[PDB]
RNA sequence: UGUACAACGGGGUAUUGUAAGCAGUAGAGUAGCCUUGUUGUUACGAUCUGCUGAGAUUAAGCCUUUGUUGUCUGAUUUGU
RNA sequence: CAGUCAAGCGUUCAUAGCGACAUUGCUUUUUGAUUCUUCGAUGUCGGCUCUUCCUAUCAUACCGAAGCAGAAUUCGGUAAGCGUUGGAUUGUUCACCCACUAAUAGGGAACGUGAGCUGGGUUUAGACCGUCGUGAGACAGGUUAGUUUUACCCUACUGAUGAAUGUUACCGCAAUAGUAAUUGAACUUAGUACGAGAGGAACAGUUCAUUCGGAUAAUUGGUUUUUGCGGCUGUCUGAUCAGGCAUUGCCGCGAAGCUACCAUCCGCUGGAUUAUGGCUGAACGCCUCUAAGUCAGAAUCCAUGCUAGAACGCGGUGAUUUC
RNA sequence: UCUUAAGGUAGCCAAAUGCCUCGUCAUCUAAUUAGUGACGCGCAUGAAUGGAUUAACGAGAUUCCCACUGUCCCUAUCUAC
RNA sequence: UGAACAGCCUCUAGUUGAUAGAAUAAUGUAGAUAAGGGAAGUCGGCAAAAUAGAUCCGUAACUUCGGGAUAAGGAUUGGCU
């Protein structure tokens, strides 16, 4: 017979299979549609999600119940030390897809990106790119003609960029590498621009702007094998159920005599690639800049790093992106930041945001102070403060 | 939002599901009101309709004045015990959940409101705002 | 914006950190944390809790400033 | 054989809520003695006060270390 | 359940909406008819959970018709994309009220679903009543109590590895498969259009919300074996200190981690079309959206985007073993 | 008036006995095939094939109310095995 | 300790036997806690929770006068002198 009362499907089907991601750095499937007009600029950036923190700002949308009144919002702060361009790959269009016909590398690749090619760096003899850097001699007799070949046959060119993993407070040293599509000039300008930037750095303030509508692409938090009740949110069976209740009861009718693919089943949860779009940048800070933890209203000399440092992460000592709302992936994790794939002329996106205050209090419990200076002021001297 | 309400009520966390009994903050003689539905509610396979601050509900007077007893009557939630977050960031809650009898258009049956009234409820419903002693 | 003062422990309440409590007699109490927000409902005395600001003021402790 | 890594120690951030010890013109008092006080004196006496936001714990998936002490070639397999 | 005709109904009028007398069908969603399958056993009603499918469409998208002034409504088309509830009583399917809602449409999958549950009903043996029986006993009559067994096999499904393609590492492409967003309210338009008045919209804009979904733990709440701190009982270590035991002794607080529409954020825009409305224009010197040609257009379809990446699809690049 | 051996008396009831039947009325509830109180031409109640009450008692059955709670809304966490 | 050959800890005595090691996924079995609501779940409050010892105050209907009754419902509770 029919289902007695209708109900929505438990869980979205567009994300199957809920298997572990291929790699810890979720790929960027799609890029903003290319132009040949605007200046050459990167379409993405690699960062490391340090954590979250609280903000207060004047909501500035007309017709709100809270127009021109304080709103408390959650933001995630992304550590973004300047990436280094180390290579350029050109793509040709084929009736079977885009095919990379050439990658061209720089001269002195960093040791931290050289570690990427190795699994056992400690005992390896570090011969990577030795003969490429040797080939780079005679003012690059092969490299020059190979760039010309890209210019001759390339429809889309992407630069290879890697993060300065050593600048972050992580225990890792094997830098992550990624392909970033270059939007901007025609192919020749892009590769000339990229050639100018070989083994040269790009920071966020040059690629992302305040109030820009960006996407975070990353691998979600993992949770190991997970039962259906949490994996799909299915109803728990009643308490008096024999042989357990954290299940789904009927996995399918007698016919078809097969468990249908669309039936909730227990297994891996998390660690999937997820793209979260339309996030708002609130502040593209500068690591060199002290007091980036303050605003035009607060005027304190505290940095963005919360007291006691971010939990599990450390401190922010580089440029950062302070973006409203959650992002996929947990702390320490590589995240990919990507420009929006369409013009977002919604009023909510065009809001001209300016912050008022930034929470520096400790994330490691219920800390009540914004800076050790203020904390000292409240409590006075201590038996330790001699 | 109720029909006589002045439009948009931001989402207060629902803490008074169907079957909850709240105090009667007005002076119509009802002692408590027992929720039988919530106006504007949704639909799900086993989800109860729930009430929040400022929601217009349909309630029954389980205890109190005889002629108010034993019939359905619309009510308006003025106090909630389930803490909820405002836009401005604060988590706040009353220690009593209570409402006031009102007709569907949104004019209170009672004359005055006892105790505080939630700011969202007062802002949403003008009549409760007029009769409210202290609004928070 | 403004920072509140906890109604029980006297700690500074920054935007959103803590809860707000409206008693039946319409007296509002802002708590910096569940610690204050729970010691209050237990009917403990702020003047008797050793780390409370009222206790510190009453016993004059640290008042040598 | 190092902006190396680790085990400890240091600092921060945190959690609880004022350690032990000592001292008191603190203490319902009760027994004992006298020089009968106005801090008399001995024994017992919960609890209070001062040292004392003290003491304890703090990554085990917290942050940072100018300190101490170490550790750093064992196996197997792979060819167009 | 759907048509065919059209006596009459409907102010006038058969066909806006109906539809008698008759009449032609369709479905297996009822009950029957048969006994072909199973009686060396296919677990048998309902509910609970969950997935998918049909369309004879309740709502939503776009439309055509009216005894459509507006408002509300009714009939109909493309349409199953998307949703179709909370409760009282009953084992109930069904039914009947209460209420919310946009709506509370009908159905299938061995009357889906018992090695998924429950065992309320039915359906062993106890027992009671009524009626029928002389009696033993009978009763889809009522009532009460009544063991609901096994998966480690194959497959299916969900997740997880994996030999070889010279080796190994990195960066990629993308065939194919999946797909998601949903609906309402308020302010304004506007007390405007419309109407004599009663009444009373809609297009755009804005702020929100419902259902669903993917993340995250800055904030709040929950959890506490941090057995972290504090406290308390009984006992034990001669007393003190410090502790043991009380299956985690208990209580207060309790970071981290996990987690909650109980917390927060986010959930994309182009084409081609259906219905339909149109154009040009013959067939049929006229006329006609139609035949040739063609324009706009739906919650439709295909893309954009998202997910996995063929482990027998593939690309670019690095380094490739001497004593 | 026909018939029997005599025609269900006192009581009780849609009761564990009432098919129609979810009987009718009242109460309980927002809503009640449930519960209770009445009504009784009662298919098919009824007097030691015992009738009607009945304080107390009941691991009997049933309904409602207060308290209580993860039974549920709506799931989350922790420990041991 | 306590009313107690209840429960918990100890003395004499006796054992330290039950295949172990490493991790801490899902589902379980056993033991808990959950904000707001409080049976809306469900055949049905099934399971759980709440109350609980003692002293004092108060105690209804009905009744076979014996009961109901610990009715219901409140207050107090250590240590030390």
Biggest contact: A-C, 16 and 13 residues
Oligomer: part of a larger assembly
Number of strands of chain B: 11
Whole-angstrom Rg of chain C: 12 Å
Round the Cα radius of gyration of chain B to an integer and report it: 14 Å
Q: Order of strands across the biggest sheet of chain C?
A: 1-2
- Largest beta-sheet characterization of chain C: 2 strands, antiparallel
The percentage helix of chain C is: 10-25%
Q: Which percent band covers the strand fraction of chain C?
A: 15-25%
Strands of the biggest beta sheet of chain B: in what spatial order? Answer: 2-3-5-6-9
Give a topology summary.
The structure is cut from a larger assembly and holds chains A (386 residues), B (136 residues) and C (65 residues).
Chain A: E1 41-42, E2 44-59, E3 69-79, E4 83-94, E5 97-105, H1 111-114, H2 130-135, H3 137-152, E6 156-162, E7 177-183, H4 187-196, E8 201-202, E9 213-219, E10 222-226, H5 228-231, E11 267-270, E12 273-284, E13 320-324, E14 334-339, H6 347-350, E15 355-358, H7 372-379
Antiparallel strand pairs in A: 1-7, 2-3, 2-14, 2-15, 3-13, 4-5, 4-6, 4-8, 6-7, 9-12, 9-14, 10-11, 12-13
Chain B: E1 16-17, E2 21-24, E3 30-38, E4 50-51, E5 56-64, E6 72-79, E7 84-85, E8 91-94, E9 98-101, E10 116-117, H1 119-124, H2 126-131, E11 134-135
Parallel strand pairs in B: 2-9, 10-11
Antiparallel strand pairs in B: 1-4, 2-3, 3-5, 5-6, 6-9, 7-8
Chain C: E1 4-5, E2 12-13, E3 19-22, E4 28-31, H1 34-41, H2 53-58
Chain A binds four RNA strands through strand 2, strand 3, strand 4, strand 5 and helix 2.
Overview of this protein structure:
The structure is cut from a larger assembly and holds chains A (386 residues), B (136 residues) and C (65 residues). Chain A has helices at residues 111-114, 130-135, 137-152, 187-196, 228-231, 347-350, 372-379; strands at 41-42, 44-59, 69-79, 83-94, 97-105, 156-162, 177-183, 201-202, 213-219, 222-226, 267-270, 273-284, 320-324, 334-339, 355-358. Chain A contains 7 helices and 15 strands. Chain B has 136 residues and is mostly beta strands. The relative contact order of chain B is 0.25. The two termini of chain B are 19 Å apart. Chain B is globular. In chain B, a hairpin with a 5-residue loop joins strand 2 and strand 3. The longest helix of chain B is centred in the last third of the chain and has 6 residues, at 119-124. A 5-stranded mixed β-barrel of chain B has the order 2-3-5-6-9. In chain B, strands 1-4 form a two-stranded antiparallel ribbon. Chain B has a two-stranded antiparallel sheet with strand order 7-8. Chain C is of the alpha+beta class and 65 residues long. In chain C, 22% of the residues lie in helices and 18% in strands. Chain C contains 2 helices and 4 strands; from the N terminus they run E-E-E-E-H-H. In chain C, strand 1 (4-5) and strand 2 (12-13) form a beta hairpin. Chain C is globular. The chains are: A alpha+beta (386), B mainly beta (136), C alpha+beta (65). Chains A and B meet through strand 2 and strand 3 of A and loops of B. Chain A binds 4 RNA strands through strand 2, strand 3, strand 4, strand 5 and helix 2. The PDB classes it as ribosome. The entry lists the keywords ribosome assembly, translation, ribosome. Eukaryotic 80S ribosome with Reh1, eIF5A and A/P site tRNA. Chain A is 60S ribosomal protein L3.
């Amino acid at each position: 017979s029919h289902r007695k009362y209708e109900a929505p499907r438990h869980g979205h089907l567009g994300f199957l299979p809920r298997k572990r991601a291929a790699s810890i750095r979720a790929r960027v499937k799609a890029f903003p549609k290319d132009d040949r007009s605007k200046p050459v600029a990167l379409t993405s950036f690699l960062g490391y999600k340090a954590g979250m923190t609280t903000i207060v700002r004047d909501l500035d949308r007309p017709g709100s119940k809270f127009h021109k009144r304080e709103v408390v919002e959650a933001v995630t702060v992304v550590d973004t030390p300047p990436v280094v361009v180390v290579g350029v790959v050109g793509y040709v269009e084929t009736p079977r897809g885009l095919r990379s016909l050439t990658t061209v590398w720089a001269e002195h690749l960093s040791d931290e990106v050289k570690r990427r090619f190795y699994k056992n760096w400690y005992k390896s003899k570090k011969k990577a790119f030795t003969k490429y850097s040797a080939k780079y001699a005679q003012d690059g007799a092969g490299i020059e003609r190979e760039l010309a070949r890209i210019k001759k046959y390339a429809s889309v060119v992407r630069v290879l960029v890697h993060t300065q993993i050593r600048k972050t407070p992580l225990a890792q040293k094997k830098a992550h590498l990624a392909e970033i599509q270059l939007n901007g000039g025609s192919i020749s300008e892009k590769v000339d621009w990229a050639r100018e930037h070989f083994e040269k750095t790009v920071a966020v303030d040059s690629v992302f702007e305040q109030n820009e509508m960006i996407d975070a692409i990353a691998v979600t938090k993992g949770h190991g094998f997970e039962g259906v009740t949490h994996r799909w949110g299915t109803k728990k069976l009643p308490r008096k159920t024999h042989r357990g209740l954290r299940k789904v009861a009927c996995i399918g009718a007698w016919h078809p005599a097969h468990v249908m693919w669309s039936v909730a089943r227990a297994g891996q949860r998390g660690y999937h690639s997820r793209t979260s779009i339309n996030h708002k940048i609130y502040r593209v800070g500068k690591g060199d800049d002290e007091a980036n933890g303050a605003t035009s209203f607060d005027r304190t000399k505290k940095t963005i790093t919360p007291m006691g440092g971010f939990v599990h992460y450390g401190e922010i000592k580089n440029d950062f992106i302070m973006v409203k709302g959650c992002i996929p992936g947990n702390r320490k994790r590589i995240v990919t930041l990507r420009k929006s794939l369409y013009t977002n002329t919604s009023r909510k996106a065009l809001e001209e945001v300016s912050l008022k205050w930034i929470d520096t209090a400790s994330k490691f419990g219920k800390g009540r102070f914004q800076t050790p200076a203020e904390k000292h002021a409240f409590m006075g001297t201590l038996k330790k403060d001699l | 939002s109720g029909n006589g309400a002045q439009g948009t009520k931001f989402r207060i966390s629902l803490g008074l599901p169907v079957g909850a009994i709240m105090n009667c903050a007005d002076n119509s003689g009802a002692r408590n009101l027992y929720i039988i539905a919530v106006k504007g509610s949704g639909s799900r396979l086993n989800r109860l309709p729930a009430a929040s601050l400022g929601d217009m509900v349909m309630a029954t007077v389980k205890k109190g004045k005889p002629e108010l007893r034993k019939k359905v009557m619309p009510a308006i939630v003025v106090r909630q015990a389930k803490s909820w977050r405002r836009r401005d960031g604060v988590f706040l809650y009353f220690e009593d959940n209570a409402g006031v009898i009102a007709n569907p258009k949104g004019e209170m049956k009672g004359s005055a409101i006892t105790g505080p009234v939630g700011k969202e409820c007062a802002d949403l419903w003008p009549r409760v705002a007029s009769n409210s002693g202290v609004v928070v | 914006m403004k920072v509140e003062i906890d109604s029980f422990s006297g700690a500074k309440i920054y935007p959103g950190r803590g809860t707000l409590f409206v008693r039946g007699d319409s007296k509002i109490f802002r708590f910096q944390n569940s610690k204050s927000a729970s010691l209050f409902k237990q009917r403990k005395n702020p003047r008797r809790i050793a780390w409370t600001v009222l206790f510190r003021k009453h016993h004059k402790k640290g008042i040598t400033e």
